[PDB]
Amino acid sequence: TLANMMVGFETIPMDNQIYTQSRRASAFSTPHTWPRCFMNIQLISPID
Amino acid sequence: ARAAFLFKTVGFGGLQNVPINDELSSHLLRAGNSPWQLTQFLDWISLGRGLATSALVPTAGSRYYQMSCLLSGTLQIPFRPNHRWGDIRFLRLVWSAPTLDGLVVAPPQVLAQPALQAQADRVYDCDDYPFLARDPRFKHRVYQQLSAVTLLNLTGFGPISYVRVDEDMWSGDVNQLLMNYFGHTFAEIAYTLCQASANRPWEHDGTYARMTQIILSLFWLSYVGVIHQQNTYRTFYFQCNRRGDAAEVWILSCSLNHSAQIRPGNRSLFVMPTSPDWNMDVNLILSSTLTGCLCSGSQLPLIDNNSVPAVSRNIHGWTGRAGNQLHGFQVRRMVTEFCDRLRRDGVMTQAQQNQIEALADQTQQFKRDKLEAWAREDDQYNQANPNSTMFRTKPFTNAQWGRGNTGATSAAIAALI
Amino acid sequence: VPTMVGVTRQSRDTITQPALSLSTTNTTVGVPLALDARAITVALLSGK
Amino acid sequence: LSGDPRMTQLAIQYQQYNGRTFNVIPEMPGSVIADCVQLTAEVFNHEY
Amino acid sequence: HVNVFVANALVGAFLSNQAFYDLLPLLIINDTMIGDLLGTGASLSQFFQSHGDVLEVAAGRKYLQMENYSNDDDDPPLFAKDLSDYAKAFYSDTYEVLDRFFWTHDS
Amino acid sequence: PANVTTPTLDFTNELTNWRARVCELMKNLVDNQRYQPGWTQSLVSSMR
Predict the structure, then answer these.
(1) Do E24 and E3 form a contact (C-beta atoms < 8 A)?
(2) CA quadruple B239, B242, B244, B247: dihedral positive or negative?
(3) Transmembrane stretches, by residue range (chain F)?
(4) To 10 degrees, what angle do helices B406-416 and B331-345 make?
């Protein structure tokens, strides 16, 4: 949700093309949908 | 991911001519002039009602064998040194276009002209023809059929089945995508998956590729009796209620309190069953189609040169000096292995396993008698028509009726776990 | 994280067809409840 | 009463996203009615 | 080490007097010019565009035509090197993946 | 590509360049020595 508001100000990488940074969070109701970029904080650029 | 495309023409087993007659070719081209069609090779059968028996097509494998011989002759025309696509008729067959998407009745002057003098066992490289080299996607799509044909040609005995295991395949929501087929029969899932692969090419390490590999692995483990409700893999297993059934199909199933244990590692290999009943075996041919698609998607290791016929040894795209060894298992003996593992587990009574074995023996005797009778009919036909000689199916021996170390291979599969 | 809870009626030794059950239909292990966030937050900020 | 009256043993389990699972099976407590029934059944066979 | 692609883009911005202060941190090469560029998503699509590793644009002119040039026979040809825009070409780390990218890419 | 959900007007356009070039060509035709004399110097300034 925060990433969705942050789009165009802070950038979040998505491991899968199908799932988007603006993808509704409610779609991510399960762990298997937890993003790999989301799973590792270090993987996400602190600068991004 | 396979990067080299080449094929070798089929060699007549002591025949001086391709073992097909114009009648057989017409039957194969019942309403179509493109052999590339998968349904062209086999009329899809749903099992139980599966298995096509015909005067020209005693088995679907018989039809595929005839298709292979016809394709081997026709393909040589654009693979001739000229590589011309429409100038001459091979048995009155003319390719419609340079891409050779379709074939047509030979022109009357061309019909008068002689057919292409195809040479047996001609190994060819796909890149040699320019139009195919021009379209990579087209070339890869055509290569699926070429790979299946080459694999059948490569096996002097029964065809091997490629099985690999990856836990990373378990990882992912693609597992949930596989779970979309939960409660589906193996055959139904295979037809849909094959259709999806036909729809588009996939990554050699593609999520679809891992899923197909998992499906094949589960089916084979279930077939050997390797995986059961009492031996579930993560609780996921293909389950067939009755072994030896006309269309017994392991169906994705879940068992609680019976999780199986698997050694960590990655294992990929091909096993070729000794029994000749595979012609009437829908699962084996479906597995062959999936394995061929898998080979088009990814370049597997070259199989052992000793594991391959000497003439075909050191095939650049298929045979290597060090490679996997084919595993030969009689279908009846393998069903016995499935029963024995369950008996050893104690899930089923010894009497029940014996009853299953008796049913299998009865089915095998009936099928063997029918195949031997077809063999006599074919020899009689060949004597009757030297001018129009043809083979309904690649010739078979009573030797194939034997187990051929099915038990040794079963121990090997158990060791593979 | 647990995904779901299921029940079995037969003894372990028996081998039988797995059939549809009520628990399987609901992915959620527990009954889902949606409530007014503002009211709860206000209560959390207002206790004496 | 939904079905499966012929159930040898009840068992219940839940599984994790990693796939680990927990199964709970209770031990059957006997019914006085059943033992009395067996005795009466033998008596009926003698006194039918 | 600093990003050569970044250095060249910064030269272009300064010449057009555009602000590259935002890209100044991006200027230092951290590990892979390709990796660093793949990470960056800022600026106009026109200013610089990379599809993953692949990026298609024009490199710097080999020759600069001056005002005196009359396209004379004695004048040396610049073979389109002088052209501010001559072509856009896709740079990428691996040829096989590049071809896969170009499987349906216009040729 | 545009970088904002609320972009600001940009004149660095091929169409804008085309419009400017066409105007400049016309202005030069106006500044033609054999064409400018007829047009009033005030009209010339206005047209430019």
Answers:
(1) no
(2) negative
(3) none
(4) 50
Close Cβ partners of B204 (under 8 Å, ≥ 6 residues apart):
B1, B2, B297, B298, B299
Closest-CA residue of chain D to B176: D17
For chain A, say whether B172 makes contact (Cβ under 8 Å): yes
d(CA B350, CA B234): 28
Q: How far apart are CA B390 and CA B400, in angstroms?
A: 22
Judging contacts by C-beta atoms under 8 Å, the chain D residues touching residue C5 are: 12-14
Please state, in angstroms and as integers, the Cα–Cα distance from residue B7 to each residue in B74, B290, B325, E29, following that order.
Answer: 14, 19, 21, 48
Asked whether B225 and B342 are in contact (CB, 8 A), the reply is yes
Backbone angles phi, psi at B327, to 5 degrees: -110, 120
Q: Check if the beta carbon of residue B65 is closer than 8 Å to that of residue B59.
A: no
- Nearest-Cα residue of chain D relative to residue C16: D7
Count chain B–chain E contacts defined by CB atoms under 8 A. Answer: 5
Declared resolution, Å: 6.5
Task: Tell me which of B168, B256, B258 to substitute to probe the interface with D (most D C-beta atoms closer than 10 Å).
Answer: B256
Instruction: Confirm if B399 and B275 have CB atoms less than 8 A apart.
Output: no
Experimental technique for the deposited model = cryo-EM
Q: Do A48 and E39 make contact, defined as CB atoms within 8 angstroms?
A: yes
In contact, B272 and B157? CB cutoff 8 Å: yes
The C-alpha atoms of residue C12 and residue B101 are separated, in whole angstroms, by 57
Token match 């009919």: residue?
B377
Q: What is the 3-state secondary structure (H, E, C) of B290-344?
A: HHHHHHHHCCCCCEECCCCCHHHCCCCCCEECCCCCCECCCHHHHHHHHHHHHHH
DSSP H helical segments within E16-80, as ranges? 24-27, 33-39
Chains interfacing with E (3 or more CB pairs < 8 Å): A, B, F
- Asked whether B134 and B122 are in contact (CB, 8 A), the reply is no
The alpha carbon dihedral of B335, B337, B340, B342 has a sign of negative
Give chain E positions within 8 Å (CB) of B136: 99, 103
Measuring CA to CA, how many Å separate A9 from each of A47, B55, B402, E41?
A: 11, 72, 72, 11
Torsion of CA B148, B150, B154, B155, to 10 degrees: 20
Rounded distance, CA B215 to CA B195, Å? 15
Cβ within 8 Å of residue B400, ≥6 positions away: B157, B158, B274, B275, B276
Q: Would the CB atoms of B257 and D15 count as touching at under 8 Å?
A: no
Q: Please indicate if any CB of chain E lies within 8 Å of the CB of F3.
A: yes
Reported as half-sphere exposure (CB side, CA atoms, 13 A), residue B216 has a value of 29
Burial class (CB in 10 A: 0-12, 13-18, 19+), B92: middle
Return the bridge partners of B11, or none: none
Contacts of C8 in chain D (CB under 8 A): 9-13
Contacts of B228 in chain C (CB under 8 A): 15
**Hey, what amino acid is at A16?**
N
Name chain D contacts of A32, Cβ cutoff 8 Å. Answer: 17
Query: Of the candidates B269, B224, B215, B219, which has an alpha carbon nearest to the alpha carbon of residue B239?
Result: B219
Residues 6+ apart with CB under 8 A from D5: none
